[PDB]
Amino acid sequence: MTWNFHQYYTNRNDGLMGKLVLTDEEKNNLKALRKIIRLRTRDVFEEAKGIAKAVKKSALTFEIIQEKVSTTQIKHLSDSEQREVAKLIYEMDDDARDEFLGLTPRFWTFQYDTLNRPFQPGQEMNINDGTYMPMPIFESEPKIGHSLLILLVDASLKSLVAENHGWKFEAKQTCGRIKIEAEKTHIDVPMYAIPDSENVNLALRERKWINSDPKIVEDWFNDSCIRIGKHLRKVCRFMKAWRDAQWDVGGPSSISLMAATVNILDSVAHDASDLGETMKIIAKHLPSEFARGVESPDSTDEKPLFPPSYKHGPREMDIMSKLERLPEILSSAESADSKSEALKKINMAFGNRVTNSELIVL
């Protein structure tokens, strides 16, 4: 029995799309969480610039500067860290202090419009909100300072964590992260120095700076959607949901999947009208795309989004293995003897989320 899966995928109620897409309410809560974080790191910078204003207006002594710092949300940093901010404020040059004074954190106006509702517990939605610091020329170091910038971001995030029950802070290599388990969401806040080569300065923790402009991949994906069609976002969500179903923790990055998928869709004839067919074409071509190594849409400077087959360890082998199963799972469900059996089989790929076998049609 040839079963069509177009409605299984695209039905916005009972179908996969229906299981994946956040409600308007749920989206708004993420936007609210984000806005809270934005306002707090804006305030923090203001509390610091406040101290720097005084210093420029009379030239405080370290001892004073420090009293004040203790009266800001920097109070949430360790003792030594509070000393460091007071110190860096104290030692600011007249010109560097003038820059600081004219420095506000800027924010870029989820997951490229492919943020899936989490599946397994406890898997969580990962939201990324960059903090951008407009500064002037950048060789090996900026006038304001990497460590001062990072401490203030840290102070914002940690102040919110202390105020809010259920929030935890976690230092990642590229960002600070606020965790909110009860809401199943992580918010990552990477910070960038901006003046597309010099707007590419991400402040690394754990080398100090790196050329990384998120806009490159953003614009790349947006162009791809326009170029390929409204189905690109849907199939990208479906691959991401596959990954969430196949691995509780682990599996390939979402961006690796997007790049390979875009690559296939750009180069292989497919019928957008039938998403079941389209996914089969994607599933057929993915393994060779991953064995090759998936390059970043950003060609400037990077490493593969997913490594070539010769560098694979047990984890990558596992991934390759599941990728090679996918097209088979998809063809089996297609030739399935029953409506219910077809649903059970395709749910081997995307997990048991869709329950209405009625969506499956001849």
Side-chain angles (χ1 to χ4, degrees), residues 1-272 274-362:
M1 319 291 301
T2 346
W3 303 107
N4 181 278
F5 294 88
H6 192 71
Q7 266 174 324
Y8 167 91
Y9 282 114
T10 72
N11 184 275
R12 316 263 174 79
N13 168 40
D14 265 335
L16 238 194
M17 285 298 292
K19 300 301 169 186
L20 257 21
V21 176
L22 294 192
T23 53
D24 279 347
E25 277 173 20
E26 302 170 311
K27 296 187 184 185
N28 289 327
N29 294 338
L30 287 178
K31 274 174 183 157
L33 287 179
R34 164 220 279 171
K35 160 173 297 183
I36 287 172
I37 287 160
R38 283 178 176 168
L39 303 172
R40 170 63 87 259
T41 94
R42 194 216 273 181
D43 294 352
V44 150
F45 269 72
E46 222 47 35
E47 290 189 331
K49 294 156 79 186
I51 303 201
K53 206 292 157 285
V55 172
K56 157 177 173 182
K57 177 180 187 68
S58 163
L60 321 184
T61 64
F62 180 72
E63 184 186 17
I64 291 162
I65 286 165
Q66 217 163 12
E67 280 171 17
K68 301 191 155 183
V69 166
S70 59
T71 80
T72 62
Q73 268 122 342
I74 300 165
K75 71 190 53 154
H76 302 95
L77 294 66
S78 66
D79 271 11
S80 49
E81 286 177 334
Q82 297 188 42
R83 199 218 186 235
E84 250 281 292
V85 164
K87 181 184 183 183
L88 289 161
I89 287 188
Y90 180 72
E91 297 177 336
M92 276 218 68
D93 210 324
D94 259 2
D95 278 359
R97 177 187 319 286
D98 277 339
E99 280 271 28
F100 186 62
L101 282 178
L103 166 76
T104 179
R106 306 247 112 106
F107 302 85
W108 184 239
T109 49
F110 294 125
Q111 294 201 358
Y112 307 118
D113 277 329
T114 71
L115 172 61
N116 288 330
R117 169 177 330 278
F119 178 37
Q120 318 198 34
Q123 283 176 326
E124 293 177 350
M125 322 190 71
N126 174 290
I127 267 29
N128 183 290
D129 193 30
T131 312
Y132 296 82
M133 312 299 321
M135 271 152 21
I137 299 151
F138 213 119
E139 275 302 77
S140 19
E141 87 154 290
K143 316 203 303 167
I144 309 233
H146 179 279
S147 66
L148 173 60
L149 259 11
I150 294 294
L151 263 13
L152 300 173
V153 166
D154 272 11
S156 304
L157 273 36
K158 297 214 222 202
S159 67
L160 293 175
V161 158
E163 304 165 44
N164 293 277
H165 184 244
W167 296 25
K168 302 177 177 184
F169 167 91
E170 190 180 293
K172 249 56 185 40
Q173 176 181 1
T174 63
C175 59
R177 169 178 288 169
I178 283 159
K179 297 155 137 303
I180 306 184
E181 261 187 6
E183 290 161 24
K184 285 168 182 185
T185 95
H186 290 179
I187 319 172
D188 292 340
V189 182
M191 91 140 255
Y192 302 92
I194 66 178
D196 179 26
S197 5
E198 303 250 356
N199 323 245
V200 206
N201 289 141
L202 160 73
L204 298 189
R205 308 156 184 253
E206 284 145 55
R207 273 129 178 154
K208 212 167 148 276
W209 297 92
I210 276 257
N211 188 84
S212 188
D213 185 349
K215 159 179 294 168
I216 292 175
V217 166
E218 297 169 11
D219 296 342
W220 161 83
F221 189 64
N222 281 321
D223 295 344
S224 295
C225 289
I226 284 164
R227 180 171 83 265
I228 289 171
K230 291 163 90 83
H231 60 293
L232 172 57
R233 277 202 174 87
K234 302 185 193 210
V235 289
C236 284
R237 279 175 143 91
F238 306 150
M239 290 313 308
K240 287 166 74 167
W242 165 80
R243 176 265 304 167
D244 295 355
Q246 297 309 313
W247 297 278
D248 196 353
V249 167
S253 70
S254 304
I255 187 64
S256 73
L257 295 157
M258 297 165 158
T261 292
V262 158
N263 263 0
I264 289 157
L265 290 190
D266 269 336
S267 62
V268 174
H270 54 283
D271 180 7
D274 190 346
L275 289 204
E277 208 81 68
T278 285
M279 288 298 294
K280 283 186 306 175
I281 286 157
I282 285 155
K284 161 191 175 186
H285 284 269
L286 244 19
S288 67
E289 186 84 357
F290 273 67
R292 180 199 319 282
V294 187
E295 285 189 332
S296 167
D298 178 359
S299 51
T300 56
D301 295 339
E302 243 208 51
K303 247 323 85 253
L305 300 187
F306 182 87
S309 58
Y310 51 79
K311 290 209 282 201
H312 286 2
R315 289 176 191 189
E316 296 73 24
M317 274 173 59
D318 183 39
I319 290 170
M320 295 310 304
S321 175
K322 303 239 192 297
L323 280 174
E324 298 171 346
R325 280 171 95 77
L326 184 53
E328 296 305 300
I329 293 179
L330 292 194
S331 0
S332 291
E334 160 171 330
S335 67
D337 338 297
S338 160
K339 197 157 301 187
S340 170
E341 286 141 308
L343 172 56
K344 183 195 67 203
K345 285 185 172 173
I346 187 170
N347 279 10
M348 293 189 64
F350 308 105
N352 261 79
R353 308 182 81 162
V354 174
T355 50
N356 189 31
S357 55
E358 223 67 83
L359 280 164
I360 297 169
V361 174
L362 294 178

